[PDB]
Design a protein around this nucleic acid. Structure first.
Lengths: 94, 96, 108, 81, 96, 81, 108, 94
DNA sequence: TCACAGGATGTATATATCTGACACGTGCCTGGAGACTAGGGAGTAATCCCCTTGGCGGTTAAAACGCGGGGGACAGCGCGTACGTGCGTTTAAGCGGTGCTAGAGCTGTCTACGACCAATTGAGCGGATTTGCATAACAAAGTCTCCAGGA
DNA sequence: TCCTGGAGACTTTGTTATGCAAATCCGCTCAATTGGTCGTAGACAGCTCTAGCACCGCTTAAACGCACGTACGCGCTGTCCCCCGCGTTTTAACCGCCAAGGGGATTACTCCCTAGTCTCCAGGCACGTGTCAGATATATACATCCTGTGA
């Protein structure tokens, strides 16, 4: 039989970090999967164009960072940037 | 005898329906409307049960949002009753 | 021979990194994807995910449940104008609406 | 078949209006509302059918509807996509 | 003496401004506004002359469309004079 | 730089309104109009500057403005695109 | 040796084909481009191009001109219902607006 | 010296085949160039996705044809389709 | 009340003039086109079996209909003021220069960077049990309308 | 005038037992990681040159500000009829069930269509040169609209 990919595992985990005693319906999960896919596409889409306009072949953390700012509200953008900045900084050191 | 006056009940219905999540429309009548329209583009079409549900929710969401704007237009004209023209104004403002 | 190890662990993330790297490779976004690219992105998606779920969990509590349903997501999102905007064109299946009644319609 | 636009009954229209915060409805709304609904459906169905035909299929799936809705500036969550 | 009546002059102006294609907002005032805003984000920022014009045309197009919708809102309320309310209503209907 | 928002003088506001078919203007419009203009302009500038920074430059070009406008459902022709 | 020629000639088109093949290929629109793809599209662009210019030329003559300017393009687009959709949100430099005066504002 | 590409040549000709006695201002030409690029990108963008949705790598005349309909109003769409059909039918037949 | 005169006003039409923005010509360089191979993507046929269509009977809310009466929509009228018109008086935006240089744009070189391949294997998937949350039923307690007289 | 206070109806709070959707466990691939190589996009330094910034002086169109009068916006009133809320009756929608087979999803082969290659040359580009349609200023003639007398 064929196999599928989704984010239901990771969404479940995150819920625990914020609310360790809270579960989630399959429908709410269906919503969360659409959410993640939507945001992913937007960032990847915008980042693609930044590379296009600046004549680059490679998407780096920068195009993503810039794309994030153009897509997110200022407050969310800041927290998102801080987390991304670290993930990359650390990954490099790790 | 006992009863409520006009305006009292209407408010309650607003409260309740805003609160709930289910469909405010009937299903079999809707399914058929979808098909009656669909056949105009192509005969012998079929639908998954999830396809129809997706259409219903999109339709209700559309109309409900329209009614909010319609209601505001009526208020702007110092009214409570909504008229067809209040709908038309809102739509046109939105570029439809 | 080193033991194989998930990149998500290195970055301290819960979301997958290697998969994101692949998705970035395809979808025809670019010819190439940088090493830190999927890492940065995974962190962002995870962050936003947490924000919705946290507010949703609070909304669920307010309705005295131990579980999140689509409706709680709806209310949780709107109660945060930053997300209301980001998702200002998203229809939530069974989200319902906010209980807003115009003051001019109230009895007095 | 036929005459399923009348299938959108009055009480249904009222209830939809109520979520919108509408308290009071004139007698001419019902017909105007139906015309509006129809246009919405025609546009969404037509696009969904187009996707279905492209794929050389007969059954319209949830994804066909979701894609059709999206591009009209409206993204639907929970049905996949 | 001789005079034109209230509203008669305004109509001629409406025609002319609809008809012509030149910019209505003065250039130097506009350019300065662009920078006055931009500096709040970044100092030592510069603009090409074509960039400033691009901004200006977009700005006028936006306001002109806004005013048309504003005008309709006032008409819907049986008025000729536009008020801040009519601006706000039109925008709100568009989800701004 | 300060108070160049007042640089958008009454005649300018009037004329823009006239092009829109507005005949008659209340005295409170002028202040409201400026607020709305500004928000529109500011949002566009911000996106354009963001693009400028990404490109590591100081001078904003027409294309940065075009992209800034575009994504808001504002395709602009005549300045390149 | 056969003599080389442009594909736009072969397809009976005025718009370049080899270039479109390339443009479709790049920008990462796809991994691959079929032989008939560029040709189909060049024809489409050509058709739409002709319609705008034709209408604008008439707009130019209404002003007794032998030349098309941005304004004429504006009028062509707006008078044509379909173009006013496809390009419905396009802002045209120095386009001006249609002479739309609401009846209720007229003197009487 | 560096170089550029535009459609000014092709736009000019198309006009002549419609109104042989008229010309085009530099701005009207600039506008037509933005127009062509805009429509091109939409069709190419949508055609890309159709292939993606249907799990395919190659864009053919059909992904474009479908994209044309989704993007153009029905009246323009069919005329465009007729012309597209011929250009390809002929090309492959010649 | 109603039309018409005409007076002033503003807009449209014809002419001359001239200038700079277009149309067209020349020479030059990548980029598109022949002619060529090699290899996986897409097309085809064959197969399984999941999901939709269709019909049935019975139960029950949900729509239809009609009645009676009050609330809001609408039209008309009066008041006063907030705007529009037009004059005279300030002011600062265009216009056409001038000169400086900071930054954009292109060249040429060298490097670490990501794509690619092949081998190895554990994270994630589907599917099978488990159990506790949400559901529905039921009765009581609390909150919110709407009169009928009275202070 | 308005304020009880009481009668009434409707929503919320608290029990209670039950069903199935969600949480967790088990076993099986194949996508993620390791660990090498290869070739090249990206970073950097450097230099040339264009376009933006700053300043100046002069003309004058456009922006201020004032004063007079008027249509407009607004509030208030008074009919009247359209929409609400209620009870009675009829209709069609759900729910659970069962049967048939069409079409979606799957694998396994085949080839032919397209990526990738070298070589060649001419179509498109930048940059000059020539011209004529459109812009300027001006006079001229034609519509239109405001206020006035006289019917």
């Amino acid at each position: 039989r064929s196999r599928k990919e989704s984010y239901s595992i990771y969404v479940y985990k995150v819920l625990k970090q914020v609310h360790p005693d809270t579960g989630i319906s399959s429908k709410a999960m269906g919503i969360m999967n659409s959410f993640v896919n939507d945001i992913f596409e937007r960032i990847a889409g915008e980042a693609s164009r930044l590379a296009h306009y600046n004549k680059r072949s490679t998407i780096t953390s920068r195009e993503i960072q810039t794309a994030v700012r153009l897509l997110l509200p200022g407050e969310l953008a800041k927290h998102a940037v801080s987390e991304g900045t670290k993930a990359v900084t650390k990954y490099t050191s790790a | 005898p006992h009863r409520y006056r006009p305006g009292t009940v209407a408010l309650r219905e607003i409260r309740r329906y805003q609160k709930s999540t289910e469909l405010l429309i009937r299903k079999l009548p809707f399914q058929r409307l979808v098909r009656e329209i669909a056949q105009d583009f192509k005969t012998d079409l079929r639908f998954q049960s999830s396809a129809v549900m997706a259409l219903q929710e999109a339709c209700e969401a559309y109309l409900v949002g329209l009614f909010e704007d319609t209601n505001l237009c009526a208020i702007h004209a110092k009214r409570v009753t909504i008229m067809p023209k209040d709908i038309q104004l809102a739509r046109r403002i939105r570029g439809e | 021979r080193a033991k194989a190890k998930t990149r998500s662990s290195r970055a301290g993330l819960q979301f997958p990194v290697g998969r994101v790297h692949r998705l970035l490779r395809k979808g025809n976004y670019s010819e190439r994807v940088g090493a830190g690219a999927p890492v940065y992105l995974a962190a962002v998606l995870e962050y936003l995910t947490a924000e919705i779920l946290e507010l949703a969990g609070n909304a669920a509590r307010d309705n005295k449940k131990t579980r999140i349903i689509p409706r709680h997501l709806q209310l949780a999102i709107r109660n945060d104008e930053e997300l209301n905007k980001l998702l200002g064109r998203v229809t939530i299946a069974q989200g319902g609406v906010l209980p807003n009644i115009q003051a001019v319609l109230l009895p007095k | 078949l036929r005459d399923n636009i009348q299938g959108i009954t009055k009480p249904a229209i009222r209830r939809l209006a109520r979520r919108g915060g509408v308290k009071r409805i004139s007698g001419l709304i019902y017909e105007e509302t139906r015309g509006v609904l129809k246009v919405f459906l025609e546009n969404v169905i037509r696009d969904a059918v187009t996707y279905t035909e492209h794929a050389k299929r007969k059954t319209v799936t949830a994804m066909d509807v979701v894609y059709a809705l999206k591009r009209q500036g409206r993204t639907l969550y929970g049905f996949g996509g």
